[PDB]
Design a protein around this ligand. Structure first.
Ligand code: ZN
Lengths: 61, 98, 126, 24, 213
RNA sequence: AACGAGGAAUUCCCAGUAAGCGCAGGUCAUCAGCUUGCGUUGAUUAAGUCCCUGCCCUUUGUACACACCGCCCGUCGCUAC
RNA sequence: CCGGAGCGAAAGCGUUUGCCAAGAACGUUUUCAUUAAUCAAGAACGAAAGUCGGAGGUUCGAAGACGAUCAGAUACCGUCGUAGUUCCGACCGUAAACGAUGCCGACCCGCGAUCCGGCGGCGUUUGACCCGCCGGGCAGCGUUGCGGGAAACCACGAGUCUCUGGGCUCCGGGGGGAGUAUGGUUGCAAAGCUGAAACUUAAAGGAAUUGACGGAAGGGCACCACCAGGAGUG
């Protein structure tokens, strides 16, 4: 399946047991669809870019 | 001393009610003293409902729910964190928690 | 799409995934979590049920099964009615392994009035 | 447990009856 | 040693022609090995399928059991065996603060098909009702159960198995009971939940081809 | 000579900080593998969480109050009535 | 479905239909016309376990075996299982049989619900729902800071109690000894009812409060916690 790219649009909050994960919603750039939320690890701010390998799941917490 | 006016049960005008069994311990608990908990949850989790949705051979199929009627004894409804020990004046609040 | 019926006996201490034909007469493939773990303590773990439904999809595809009707089942009867931890891991592994799912429905043996459940009137005092 | 003080008392009274019965 | 699936051949299961589709799926059985013919197992199987899998524009919580009775040319023919609602929809109709009046009859059709139809109805709260509980009195419970048992037999006694099935796929029996009970107490979810077939008569293939024709 | 980035575990730390390097003071007739200071070179990672282990507050329970290192029960054993 | 809803003197009582004879409340310009209330002696009933005699023994499960844990478990946990649990008759008359609160009667607050019956009112709906009211029934909330109480709490009064008297029955007199001994009595038995004394003791106990503690809950905090790693120890 073709790979899709997306830009970080908004940071929600810290998730995980140790609080290392950061729930951040993303939005595709090429095709306007699937403005789904994902879980990111590390320092994340508004304006980052996440190379989503898939576009199927949300994976909340 | 009498801790509750209703003695922790809903027996008013009766002498004996039918005892039922608990869920996580299987203890004989009276029907009026049981800690009712009507659990209604989806069959598939919200984290996995999307994988089942795309694998559905239909266009729009609402996933049914798990309608489970649970009964808890006092010793287990507190250990399972279903009910808590409230303050002396807070125990009189019969309103269900939001 | 070759529709089938998948019986998931999701209980405690073990998790069963039983795939049969549309009538449930002939068993096409069925495995347990103990067939994938060394210690039986990890049977009710969702990771064991994750590996169970994974290889099932291959046996379903080898024989031609493409779609599976989910029949979730707990212990039922006098014991608990909520399915075990393998109810969701086995269900998600079925769709993610390149299969089809349709008309999900749970069949738990709930009694109109059962006999005396195991454990006295004081309950299991673990 | 006051119930087992009643359990041991009924057990002691029952023994006193057997001792008193053999003296008939 | 040898894979037992090598001797298994697929059979396309069928259904009566009164529905919208006859193709219900595929089954499997081993071929004839010795005296045990493959037909000796495909004449007693039961397929529990929902109404949405049988009809095209109906509900999905009404399941129909279809027992196999004949195999003609690598395909397995089926017929009515019993109706039953889903476990989830049954637990959702039962609600609190309202009376539940159940009923059950065991009456046969014009033929020897002994059917046991189960109907369940709940009362309805009025729109301008301020009272939380909608409780009908015990004698008011009897009158509702009387009409519930009377219509189940009357509608199934004046027709054979073929016609009552077409009257069973929709809630035709359930909608008239609510209208009948409204004269005493309004009901909400009058539904025929389960149909059990206890005894089966001497089946004739002539009446089977008349339905599937 | 052992020691080939080191068993199960475990200590410390987020900015001139950790560490590396060396100096000086205290001890001191003789002495620093220590410690208190000092400057020097200078990052990795994190601008977080109750996850874990330690911690106070509130509610709650108590037959505890020289206060859970609390209090207290029975059998057995000794003596007296 | 099933509720702080009903019924019964209580124990107790919820699948359908049928049979059987009761009962409160309400309705009443019916009827009877003080025929009452409470009650030593006496009696019916009385959960469960147990006991005797049959049936049936699914499940559970005293006892019991075995598996685990522990310093040790004769237990909790697990497998299995006797009696028992189920039904039939005769016993036993004991429960935290509790509302830990006798019955009858009067008087003494309010409000919103709820249960049955009766009554009168816009409407909606072919009795249902709506707004009230009178009578009892289970209860609830508010005020008890019109009272009561040691207080918790009490209008199913636990109010009208030194401003002490409506009627009646039962019953308590510091804590133990002790519901023991003995006698009578009931029972097949286990035991039930009745019921002491010697002796010992300065407290036992009730309610409430502040501390402490919990292997209770909730919230919050620190690289002497972790996450991310970086040094070094072992
Ligand atoms: Zn319980």
């Amino acid at each position: 399946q073709p790979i899709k790219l997306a830009r970080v649009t908004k940071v929600l909050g810290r998730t995980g047991s140790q609080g290392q994960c950061t729930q951040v919603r993303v939005e595709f750039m090429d095709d306007s669809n699937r403005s789904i939320i994902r879980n990111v690890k590390g320092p994340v701010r508004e304006g980052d870019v996440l190379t989503l390998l898939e576009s199927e799941r949300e994976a909340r917490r | 001393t009498k801790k509750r006016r209703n003695n922790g049960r809903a027996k008013k005008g009766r002498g004996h009610v039918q005892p039922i069994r608990c869920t996580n311990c299987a203890r004989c608990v009276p029907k009026d003293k049981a800690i009712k908990k009507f659990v209604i949850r989806n069959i598939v989790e919200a984290a996995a409902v999307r994988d089942i949705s795309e694998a559905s051979v239909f266009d729009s199929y609402v996933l049914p729910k798990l309608y489970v009627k649970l009964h808890y004894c006092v010793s287990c409804a507190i250990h399972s964190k279903v009910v808590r020990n409230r303050s002396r004046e807070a125990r009189k609040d019969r309103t269900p928690p939001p | 799409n070759v529709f089938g019926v998948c019986h998931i006996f999701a209980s405690f201490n073990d998790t069963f995934v039983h795939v049969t034909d549309l009538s449930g007469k002939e068993t096409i493939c069925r495995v347990t979590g103990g067939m994938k773990v060394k210690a039986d303590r990890d049977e009710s773990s969702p990771y064991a049920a994750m590996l169970a439904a994974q290889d099932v999809a291959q046996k379903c595809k080898e024989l031609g099964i493409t779609a599976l009707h989910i029949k979730l089942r707990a212990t039922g009867g006098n014991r608990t009615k909520t399915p075990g931890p393998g109810a969701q891991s086995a269900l998600r592994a079925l769709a993610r392994s390149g299969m089809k799912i349709g008309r999900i429905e749970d069949v738990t043996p709930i009694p109109s009035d059962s006999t005396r459940r195991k454990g006295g009137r004081r309950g299991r005092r673990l | 447990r006051a119930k087992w003080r009643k359990k041991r008392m009924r057990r002691l009274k029952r023994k006193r009856r057997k001792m008193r019965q053999r003296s008939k | 040693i040898v894979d037992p699936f090598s001797k298994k051949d697929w059979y396309d299961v069928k259904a009566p022609a009164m529905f919208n589709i006859r193709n219900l799926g595929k089954t499997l059985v081993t071929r004839t090995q010795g005296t045990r013919i493959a037909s000796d197992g495909l004449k007693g199987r039961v397929f529990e399928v929902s109404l949405a899998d049988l009809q095209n524009d109906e509900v999905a919580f009404r399941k129909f059991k279809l027992v196999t009775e004949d195999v003609q040319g690598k395909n397995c023919l089926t017929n009515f065996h019993g109706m039953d609602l889903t476990r989830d929809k049954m637990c959702s109709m039962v609600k609190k603060w309202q009376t539940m009046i159940e009923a059950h009859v065991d009456v046969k059709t014009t033929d020897g098909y002994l059917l046991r139809l189960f109907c369940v109805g709940f009362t309805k709260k009025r729109t301008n009702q301020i009272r939380k509980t909608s409780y009908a009195q015990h004698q008011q419970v009897r009158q509702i159960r009387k009409k519930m048992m009377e219509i189940m037999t009357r509608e199934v006694q004046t027709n054979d198995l073929k016609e009552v099935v077409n009257k069973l796929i929709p809630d035709s029996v359930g909608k008239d009971i609510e209208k009948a009970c409204q004269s005493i107490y309004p009901l909400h979810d009058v539904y025929v939940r389960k149909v059990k077939m206890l005894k089966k008569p001497k089946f004739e293939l002539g009446k089977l081809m008349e339905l599937h024709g």
